[PDB]
Amino acid sequence: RRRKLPATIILRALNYTTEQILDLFFEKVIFEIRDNKLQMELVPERLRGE
Amino acid sequence: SQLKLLVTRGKEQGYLTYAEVNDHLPEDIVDSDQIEDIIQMINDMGIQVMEELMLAENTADEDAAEAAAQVLSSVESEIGRTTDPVRMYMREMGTVELLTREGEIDIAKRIEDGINQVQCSVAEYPEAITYLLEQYDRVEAEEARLSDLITGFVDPELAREKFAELRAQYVVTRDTIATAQEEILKLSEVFKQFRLVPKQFDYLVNSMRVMMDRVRTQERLIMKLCVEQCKMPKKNFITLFTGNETSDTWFNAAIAMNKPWSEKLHDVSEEVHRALQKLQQIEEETGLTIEQVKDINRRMSIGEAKARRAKKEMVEANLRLVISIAKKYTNRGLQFLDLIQEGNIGLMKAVDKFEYRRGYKFSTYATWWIRQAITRSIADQARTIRIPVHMIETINKLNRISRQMLQEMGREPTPEELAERMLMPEDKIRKVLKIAKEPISMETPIGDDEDSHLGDFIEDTTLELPLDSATTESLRAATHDVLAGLTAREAKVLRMRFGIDMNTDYTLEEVGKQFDVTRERIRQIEAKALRKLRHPSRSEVLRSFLDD
Amino acid sequence: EFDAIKIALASPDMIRSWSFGEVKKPETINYRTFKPERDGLFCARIFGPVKDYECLCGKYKRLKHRGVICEKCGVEVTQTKVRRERMGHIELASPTAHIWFLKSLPSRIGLLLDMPLRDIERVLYFESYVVIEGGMTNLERQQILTEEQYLDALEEFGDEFDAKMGAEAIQALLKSMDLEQECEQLREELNETNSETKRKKLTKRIKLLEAFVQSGNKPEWMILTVLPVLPPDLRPLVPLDGGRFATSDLNDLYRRVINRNNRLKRLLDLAAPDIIVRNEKRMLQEAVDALLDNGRRGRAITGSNKRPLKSLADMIKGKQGRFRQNLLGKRVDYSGRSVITVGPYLRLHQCGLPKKMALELFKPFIYGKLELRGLATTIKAAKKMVEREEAVVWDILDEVIREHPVLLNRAPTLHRLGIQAFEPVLIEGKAIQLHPLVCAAYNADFDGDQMAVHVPLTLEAQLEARALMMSTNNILSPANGEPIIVPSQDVVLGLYYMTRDCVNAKGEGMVLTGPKEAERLYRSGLASLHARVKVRITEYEKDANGELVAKTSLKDTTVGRAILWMIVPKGLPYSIVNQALGKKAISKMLNTCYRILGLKPTVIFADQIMYTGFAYAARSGASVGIDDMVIPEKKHEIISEAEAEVAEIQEQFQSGLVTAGERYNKVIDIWAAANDRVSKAMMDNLQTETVINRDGQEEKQVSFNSIYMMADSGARGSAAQIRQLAGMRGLMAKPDGSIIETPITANFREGLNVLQYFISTHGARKGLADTALKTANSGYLTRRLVDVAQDLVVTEDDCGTHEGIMMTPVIEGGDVKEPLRDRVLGRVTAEDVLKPGTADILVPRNTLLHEQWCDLLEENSVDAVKVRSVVSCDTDFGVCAHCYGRDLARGHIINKGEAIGVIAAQSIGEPGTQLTMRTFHISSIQVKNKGSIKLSNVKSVVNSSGKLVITSRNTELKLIDEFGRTKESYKVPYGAVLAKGDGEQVAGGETVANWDPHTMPVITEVSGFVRFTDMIDGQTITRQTDELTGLSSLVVLDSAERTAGGKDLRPALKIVDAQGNDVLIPGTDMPAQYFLPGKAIVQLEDGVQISSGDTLARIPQKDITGGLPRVADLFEARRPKEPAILAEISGIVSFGKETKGKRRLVITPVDGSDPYEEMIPKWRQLNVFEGERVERGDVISDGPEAPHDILRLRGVHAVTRYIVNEVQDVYRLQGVKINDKHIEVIVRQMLRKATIVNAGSSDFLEGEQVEYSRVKIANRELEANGKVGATYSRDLLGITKASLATESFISAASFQETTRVLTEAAVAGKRDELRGLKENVIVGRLIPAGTGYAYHQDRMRRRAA
Ligand SMILES: [Zn+2]
Ligand SMILES: [Zn+2]
């Protein structure tokens, strides 16, 4: 019932650095310069209800 | 501070839960007690705290609201604020040095010299040595126990001759009162080889203290009469009074000063002459001067204070020792701090009875005295109905032979079995095991619907029922009637012989003196009246009061 | 005997004078011979003898030694009651602060010395030192030092400086301090200085000092130098069964104090090491505080059995304390308890009392009567006779019982009709037979309920059961005049079966010569109870002056109504019995019998109605069978249609046409419609289905279905419950409101399979659990309102004021909801009320408007009547008899000595038991009838269009026909396009005005060109492009996105003529231009015309709570979260600095303090323009009104009208009726506090909150003088704070925090003149309310002779 530390502190205590943490809890959107200024790597389903 | 936002948060929401209180606390508040006290602060003002249509009421307040808010703002900085006795004492006991590793013998030597200074100080007093020769003569003349004066020395008969020798030396010291100084030094060096009983020594010291008090009280009668009423000047009274102390010049040749203050002491003139003669007379009552015995008991109080200011240090260390020892009885029906206090008192007891002469370490012996005194105070003041200490020891040995007889005999002890294994007569063991149980609290929450307690069902066995008071007033009326049916002889003599409508019932002789007749006539008259009352028409109404 | 209860501190000499001896040893008793040990906590030498008139040793036992102090053990020979009043004292060798005066928060010790709390408790426990007049060297009076600071002080500053430690230091500090000197210094710091809140706290301290001077207290008494021990028989140690004693914890606490005190004495006389002595002093202090109030400084100690030992403070305070649980309500003799049964043979004033329960309650009276009649020689013979139940004891008992009433009382006595007095009837059994009609009063049925019986013993107490608390005097409910002698369930059905008719029954259509012949026909078996028939009945009418003019005629009635007519008393009409007589009609018949014929005829009518109802209900044989729940045969096809529509929706959901929540809502809507359809089908099959033949073919009438008869008569049932028996059960609901979509399409007649039953158990158990709380927390509102409004009593027949309330009908929405005859009935008018043409002096001022004057009022169609209210009464400490009106029940006029406060609380709280325990939520005018237009705030313009538009803001429009009465009321917006305008009397089928929420107009005064002045786009206006019409729009916006260059500047639309001159606003020389805030689209251009109020700027685009929490909150007077700010002052408005959450709203009065300004929360939709003259007591933004706001603005009648209407809304929502007198009384207690605006010639503080009655009397007697009074300002409190402020500290300690109250009383030295209902009850005296009010008046006359 102690004070409410943030939730990433325990993820760090488990020896997780920031990079693989964000790899754990999220998905990935890919951008690249394919001759026009960082084209987007589009997915069909993710653009629903937007 | 951050708790301010917490109070305003609780006031916004109208409540405060244990989660938010655990969050918003000062982080290094490690003290759960001040935690409880600060939540009791935030609640005692209102808002009310919980742990998870909350429309009851507010209950408070514009006066205590800012009071508790002020206490919170202060307590945000309350760093060392445990504020309870058991922890405050531990703090102020560990804070003091544990400077005791066979420095006890150095402290003991300090006490040894300090207690010999008081010895020599008293022994330089003439009238006390007179008292000692007195008690040698009385204790050997059968006034008390034969060793009721001395605690040994560095033998009844050679000791009596020793004391006759000391008596001769001191009485010639008195004979040769300069010449008296050398003989009083003789006195001191010849008594310096002896050792008195500490009770006689105690009366000695208390008599010196009464000397000091009376001499200072005559000091007050001298000074306050002019030095505190007429405003007698300070430094001139100093350089004249102390500095002369004997002659008439300090007062009789000072009334002739005609100063602004010597024109003020003609009022107390004869009074301060009484004080002067009392000075010289008390010098006789003590034998020697006021200055002499005064500085005597002064240096004696120096030595006594020197001794006491070391028992302080060793009781500091050994009181850490007592908090060590006491913790074996935390669940004996006595408070922990009271245990530690009894241990401290016993520790002073043992410190005044600790001896380096056996070369024994302090702890093992002071802990002896401390365990003694602590078990003593437990047996004394741990139970409301005080059973004496021996009864507690008996119930303890009964209990100790009860666990044994249980683990062995399987089933349970019994008074037959216990009177077998123990040496008691099978019935006082009955009463012992009847005695041991504690009075249940009268506020025990009963297993009822109304939140009832055990104190609500304890009936009353002394009250007389109003059918039994209206069955006594009816009897008083009936007897007043049935006595009215009678001559003044019988009526008066029966109201007087018994307590009827009157004060104390008199004997026969008092009734006779009221009637001027001898007791046997009174007996005949009362028997006549009772015979007359025994028959019906005078008995039917009284008799119905007898349901037997 | 004794006048007021004085209170103060206790001098150590006073505490030594109380005691009868010191307590030196912690010994209770000896362990073998249980006699008091010493000189101990139980001592015969101090606390009197342990046996009556008996010394301890035994040397003195006769009464003749009465009073002696025995030579051996010094035990004064006297009564053992003496052991229950003598007190001891413990002599604390060290001082010890009173924890009440060190943790009272504010600490009285602390706030007296002006030393903060932690400093005090740091010098207390020897953590530090505190100087006490530390000489002429370095320091302050209360300068606290640390240890080493003091050590180095004694070096450099040896003497002529004294700093102590511990409670000794606080004692010396309080002692040396001189109150008048510091009080002077506080005067100088208060009047020579101006730092507002600092001077608020300063003046609080100043008042405390002046109170401590006014009282006899000395500050150095807050440190216990001497401690008194309670008398032993209050903290007893009693022998139980088995020799194991039983003790109250106070013995433990006294013992712990005494041991520690003796040990401190020991250690002090050992010259002990002073750290140990510090610990002993600290422990003794903690012990004294556990003794005084355990668990108030640290953690409760302990107890011996692991539970917090209770101390004296615990003995007083707490719900389970002494002020509450044996002081206000205690156990009582002469009382019994038994299972109540019914016994319908009783008369309404009597109840069956078992012989066995009556022979025990009257044993004193029976003994007396036996000994009086000589049947028994003495009291003992009498007792024996009663003990063997002789034959004569039943005659003696029938004579004791005869005129002796007994009080019958059910458990939760919510309202005062729960303790009623009956005359007993010695019945055989062991169950009280309770008259049926009373069970609605008691709220008691016979499923096993029990009742308590008490005997009113004395003469004056057994004429109060006869004159006040008797069952026959109480037939009207005090919460509303409607008689609570309503026949309930067998009687209304007996009367419904009796007074009905059938199309063709035996003996139809035969002329009868009176009710007697109808009864003889029915009993003979020649004509049925409902056969249409003509009877010559003779009815009387006493509209004559007391005389009953008769009239006989051939009524066309039935045999049932005929037979019932014999029962009716004389002066009632025949239409009262010539309908089918439901339950509503059955109690209206009783109400008319009362309002024509007083009380006694109604009392006889009640049990006559009850006997005849039971008789003919039994005659009817009205049973119930499983064939009486005729299910409609159209239920199956309706359910097939419903399942079809639900399948349609499921397919449209699988097709992608609706969300999931939308399918849920549409499914629930389909099933709800289907359930209403099936219930209407079953009711149409039930109600009329009886088809009979009259001289031929056929005819339908009202059905004789047994279950339908129960539903229709009003005995038991509804459409909902019959529907569940016959129709479908519809949709269940989970507990949290989550309606299940699978509906129980079955009823209980047919089966319920497993799944439907398990579904229904959800809401079933939720309802059960909810009424498991609403029973537990039964009367908490009455308790909270008997706390705030208890000591009001009607104490004057007239205050003679002229102030009241302008009571009118609640004509809201359409037709009225509550007419004028409901709300003006029983109150005395405040002023002579004339006809609308005034025609006469219609109603005098102080005439009690009973039924006749209400007839007069609604013949003339009087719409508004001023009627005196109790919140305006000028009485002192009470309420005049006329400013309360007519009292219900008794129904004549309240007589002085009525405790109207308790009654008001009980009448708001018994009805509140019938309310929901949870709080729950819920173009063109379709004007209704013919009537005329009614304008409030008449400022309208007729456009060039011809229709009207409100150029005012809050113009309220009413439809008022030729009656004089108002028939419709409506709130009109700012300038709706009114089809009908001002005064235009029109009829139904004609809308009064068209409008649009997308259209809030900024219509002007005159017609003309709208030039654009003070308008530069880019700073205040927005570019709204007309893609809809083909133009350009510059819409008014604020500084939300435009920069601050011209952000505050308003876009001015200059309405001018064709020449270019600024046309003024007709009325004020400021021309007809408008400064516009946002939300009003502008479709004009610069240099464009508009008609007479043409569309310049157009602004594009009922829930009620009802739970009993919505009454606890209505009364608690809190502040809503959308609080509609009002118009504080009249005059004009200015808007200033924005974008802060408080935009400046300046109010320039006409002739007042012109720079007046306030703040505005700019998240809000501000709904008033800046040019319109603000009117004081008027709303600006629209939202819920705050009570304190109304109270400060419009007046006490404004707040009272608001509170009364809101509580009446929540009470009428559930149909529960309660009068408004009671809520006006609760309000009158609510706004009891005045505040001092100007000190004036008055003698209160500057901004001090004082009792409004106090300021009233003071400034009134000054107004009689030549000096200017104090200009008060009335506050408004919540019930749990209007009760917090009470004059008498006894009652305050009763229902409040006791330690706070007694600490305040002790310091202030208050004297409690017992003149409240809740104080006298505690001290055993008569309450100064009812029967004892004359006695208390005679007491007040004896005092000050
Ligand atoms: Zn005696
Ligand atoms: Zn009045």
* Residue whose entry in the numeric block shows the structure tokens 């009956």: C422
DSSP output for B385-430:
S---HHHHHHHHHHHHHHHHHHHHHSS---HHHHHHHSSS-SSHHH
* Neighbouring subunits of A (3+ Cβ pairs under 8 A): B
- Cross-chain Cβ contact A1/B25 below 8 Å: no
Question: What one-character DSSP code corresponds to residue C767?
Answer: H
Alpha-carbon span C1216 to C1203, nearest angstrom: 17
In chain A, count H helices and then E strands.
Answer: 2, 2
Cα C424 to Cα C402: distance, rounded to the nearest angstrom: 8
CB-based contacts of C866, cutoff 8 Å, min separation 6: C804, C805, C806, C807, C829, C830, C831, C833
Q: Do A3 and B18 touch (CB under 8 A)?
A: no
Chain A residues with CB-CB distance to B under 8 A?
1-4
Length of chain A: 50
CA distance A33 to A27: 20
Domain at C1307, CATH number: 1.10.150.390
Distance between CA atoms of residues C348 and C607, nearest Å: 6
Cα separation of C87 and C909, whole Å? 45
* Helix/strand/coil (H/E/C) assignment for every residue in C345-394: CCCCCEEEEEHHHHHHHCHHHHHHHHHHHCCCCCHHHHHHHHHHCCCCHH
Question: Quick check: helix, strand or coil at residue C1142?
Answer: coil
Mutate to test the interface with A, among B2, B6, B16, B23 (most CBs of A within 10 A): B23
In three-state secondary structure terms, C315 is helix
Q: What is the spatial distance between Cα B353 and Cα B34, in angstroms, rounded to a whole number?
A: 42
Q: How many Å separate Cα C1150 from the centre of its chain? A: 42
Experimental technique used?
Answer: cryo-EM
Q: Would strands C805-807 and B440-441 be described as parallel, antiparallel, or unpaired?
A: unpaired
Q: Is there a single domain that holds both residue C1019 and residue C973?
A: no
By the 8 A CB rule, do B57 and C1295 touch?
Answer: no
> In C772-929, at which residue ranges do the beta strands (DSSP E only) sit?
794-796, 805-807, 865-867, 879-880
Residues C1037 and C992 placed together within one structural domain of the fold: no
Nearest to B434 among C30, C243, C301 (CB): C243
Write the Ramachandran bin of C730: left for phi over 0, alpha for psi from -120 to 50, otherwise beta.
Answer: left
For the record, the structure tokens of C169 come out as: 């230091």
- Residue linked to tokens 């997308």: C998
* Cα separation, C1035 vs C1098, whole angstroms: 10
Nearest CA-CA distance, residue C40 and chain B, Å? 11
* Chain B residue set in contact with A, beta carbons under 8 Å: 18-19, 22-23, 25, 27
CB B427 within 8 A of CB C207: no
The CA C308 to ligand 2 mean position distance, Å, reads 52
Cα C1270 from chain centre:
32
State whether residue C600 is helix, strand or coil.
helix
Which residues does a gap of C–N over 2.5 Å follow in chain B?
Answer: 52, 154, 177
Using DSSP, state whether B49 is helix, strand or coil. Answer: strand
Q: Angle formed by the axes of helices B336-351 and C249-268, to 10°?
A: 20
Between chains, do B441 and C276 touch, taking CB under 8 Å as contact? no
Q: What's the rounded Cα separation, in Å, for the pair C204 and C189? A: 13
| Strand, helix or coil for residue C111 | helix
State how far the Cα of C254 lies from the Cα of C577, in Å rounded to an integer: 76
CB contact under 8 A, B19 and A2: no
Q: Is the dihedral of CA C795, C798, C801, C804 positive or negative?
A: positive
> Of C1157, C1129, C1156, which Cα lies nearest the Cα of C1144?
C1157
Rounded Cα–Cα distance for residues C580 and C602 (Å)? 21
Identify the CA nearest to C812 among candidates C986, C970, C985, C936. C970
Of all residues in chain B, the one with the smallest CA distance to C50 is B462
HSE-up of C206 (CA within 13 Å, CB side)?
16
What is the distance, to the nearest Å, from the Cα of residue C1316 to the centroid of all Cα atoms in its chain?
Answer: 19
Same domain, C973 and C939: yes
Ligand 2: distance of its center to the CA of C704 in Å?
Answer: 55
Q: Which alpha helices (H) appear in B57-197, and where do they start and end?
A: 64-75, 85-94, 104-123, 126-140, 157-175, 179-191
Kindly state whether residues C739 and C665 are assigned to the same domain: yes
CATH value at residue C1009: 2.40.50.100
Residue C268 makes CB contacts below 8 A (sequence gap 6+) with C93, C277
Q: Is beta strand C227-229 parallel, antiparallel or unpaired with respect to C163-164?
A: unpaired
C1061 contact partners, CB below 8 Å, separation of at least 6: none
Residue in chain C closest to B453 (alpha carbons) equals C320
Q: Is C391 exposed, middle or buried (0-12, 13-18, 19+ CB in 10 A)?
A: exposed
- The whole-angstrom separation of Cα B538 and Cα B532 is 8
CA atoms in the 13 A half-sphere facing the CB of C1111: 33
CA B530 – CA B518 distance, rounded (Å): 19
Our measurement of the distance from residue C301's CA atom to the centroid of its chain's CA atoms, rounded to an integer in Å, reads 40
In this structure, what token pair is assigned to residue C880?
């005049």
Q: Are strands C1064-1065 and C1068-1071 parallel, antiparallel or unpaired?
A: antiparallel
Q: Is C568 exposed, middle or buried (0-12, 13-18, 19+ CB in 10 A)?
A: buried
> Chain B: residue nearest A3 by CA?
B23
Tokens of C1166: 């501000």
Residues with Cβ within 8 Å of residue B333, at least 6 apart in sequence: B378, B382, B383, C304
**Given in angstroms, what resolution was this structure solved at?**
3.4
CA distances from C355 to B101, C77, C346, C397 (A): 90, 47, 16, 9
Domain match, C698 and C741 both: yes
Any idea how long chain C is? 1345
Chain B CB contacts of C166 under 8 Å are none
- C-alpha span between B471 and B546 (Å, rounded): 11
Strand C532-541, strand C511-512: pairing: parallel
How many A from CA of C1222 to the centre of ligand 2?
Answer: 15
Query: For C79, which residue in chain B has the nearest alpha carbon?
Result: B462
**Strand, helix or coil for residue C959:** strand
Q: What is the 3-state secondary structure (H, E, C) of C930-941?
A: CEEEEEECCCEE
The backbone torsions φ and ψ at residue C532, rounded to the nearest 5 degrees and listed phi first, read -60, 140
Cβ-Cβ pairs closer than 8 A, B with C, add up to 204
Closest CA to C5 of C1335, C1342, C1294, C1098: C1294
Same domain membership, residue C743 and residue C716: yes
Show the CA angle centred on residue B536, arms to residues B535 and B538, nearest 5°.
Answer: 85
User: Which residues in chain B are closer than 8 Å to A5, comparing Cβ atoms?
Assistant: none
CATH assignment at residue C730:
1.10.132.30
Q: Residue C1054 burial by CB count (10 A; 0-12/13-18/19+): exposed, middle or buried?
A: buried
Task: Using CB atoms, pick whichever of B18, B23, B27 lies closest to residue A4.
Answer: B23
CB C432 within 8 A of CB C406: no
Closest-CA distance, B66 to chain A, in angstroms, reads 27
Distance CA C203, CA C480 (A): 49
Strands of the sheet containing C1145-1148, edge to edge, are C1132-1135, C1145-1148, C1156-1158
The ligand minimizing its distance to the Cα of C878 is: 2
d(CA C259, CA C263): 6
The phi, psi pair for C549, rounded to 5°, reads -80, 130
What residues contact B533, with CB distance under 8 A and at least 6 apart? Answer: B482, B486, B539, B542
Neighbours of B251 (CB within 10 A): 21
* Gyration radius of chain C over CA positions: 40
- Chains C and B in direct contact, meaning 3 or more beta-carbon pairs closer than 8 angstroms: yes
Query: Are B328 and B378 in contact, with CB atoms under 8 Å apart?
Result: no
Judging by beta carbons within 10 Å of its beta carbon (0-12, 13-18, 19+), is residue C894 exposed, middle or buried? buried
DSSP B251-276: TTTTGGG-STTTTSSSSSHHHHHHHH
- For the CA atoms of C1288, C1294, C1300, C1306, the dihedral, rounded to the nearest 10 degrees, stands at 50
CA torsion sign for C1012, C1016, C1018, C1019 is negative
Degrees (nearest 5) of the Cα angle C1028, C1034, C1037? 115
> Given the structure tokens 């003789």, which residue do they identify?
B186
Q: What are phi and psi of C943, to 5 degrees?
A: -65, 175
The span from the CA of C1001 to the CA of C977, in Å, is 9
> Is B85's CB within 8 Å of C286's CB?
yes
Contacts of C147 by beta carbon, 8 Å cutoff, 6+ apart: C128, C129
> After which residues does chain A become discontinuous at a C–N distance over 2.5 Å?
none
Ligand nearest to the CA of C871: 2
Residues C1035, C1079: Cα–Cα separation, whole Å: 8
User: What gap in Å lies between CA C173 and CA C162, rounded to an integer?
Assistant: 11
- Please work out, in degrees rounded to the nearest 5, the angle formed at the alpha carbon of residue C757 by the alpha carbons of C754 and C761: 135
Q: Are residues C662 and C740 in the same domain?
A: yes
Taking CA atoms, what residue in B is nearest to C147?
B92
Residue among C266, C282, C304 minimizing CB distance to B333: C304
CB spacing of B438 vs C125 below 8 angstroms:
no
Cα(C82) to ligand 1 centroid in Å equals 17
- C959 shares its domain with C1016: no
Element (H, E) at C89: strand C87-90
Which region, left, alpha or beta, applies to residue C891 given φ > 0 means left and ψ of -120 to 50 means alpha? Answer: left
- 8-state DSSP, C1258: H
Residues C983 and C1037 in one domain: no
Contact C738, C714 (CB under 8 A): no
Are residues C298 and B478, on separate chains, in Cβ contact within 8 Å? no
Q: Tell me whether strands C19-22 and C87-90 are parallel, antiparallel or unpaired.
A: parallel
Q: Is residue A39 helix, strand or coil? A: strand
**Measured between alpha carbons, how far apart are the two ends of chain C, in Å?**
16
> Nearest CA to C412 among C450, C446, C448, C438?
C450
Q: Give the three-class secondary structure for B175.
A: helix
What residue in B sits closest to A5 (Cα-Cα)? B23
- Closest CB from B455, B471, B540 relative to C248: B455
List, as one string, the DSSP characters of C485-548.
Answer: ----SHHHHHHHHHS--BSS-TTTT-EESSHHHHHHHHHHTSS-SSBEEEEEEEEEETTTTS--
Helix (H) or strand (E) segment spanning residue B303: helix B290-326
Neighboring chains of B (3 or more beta-carbon pairs < 8 A): A, C
Ligand 1 centroid from CA C257, angstroms: 29
**Distances from the Cα of B527 to the Cα of B475, B480, B504, B532, angstroms:** 21, 18, 20, 9
Cβ pairs bridging A and B (under 8 Å):
10
Domain of C761 in residue numbering reads as 634-777
Using CA coordinates, name the residue in chain A closest to B19.
Answer: A1
Tell me the chain B residues in contact with residue C260 when contact means C-beta distances shorter than 8 Å. 338
Nearest-angstrom CA–CA distance, C470 and C420:
6
Contact B19 A4 (CB under 8 A): yes
Quick one: C978 and C940 in the same domain? yes
State the nearest Cα–Cα gap between C992 and chain B, in angstroms: 42
- Asked if residue C772 and residue C669 are part of one domain, the reply reads yes
**Buried/exposed code over B145-160 (b: 16+ C-beta within 10 A; e: otherwise):** eeeebbeeeeeeeebe
Residue B170 to residue B191: CA distance in whole angstroms: 9
Nearest 5°: phi and psi at C1026?
Answer: -85, 80
CA distance linking residue C1339 with residue C449, whole number of Å: 43
- Are B474 and C379 in contact (CB < 8 Å)? yes
Do C969 and C1010 fall within a single domain?
no
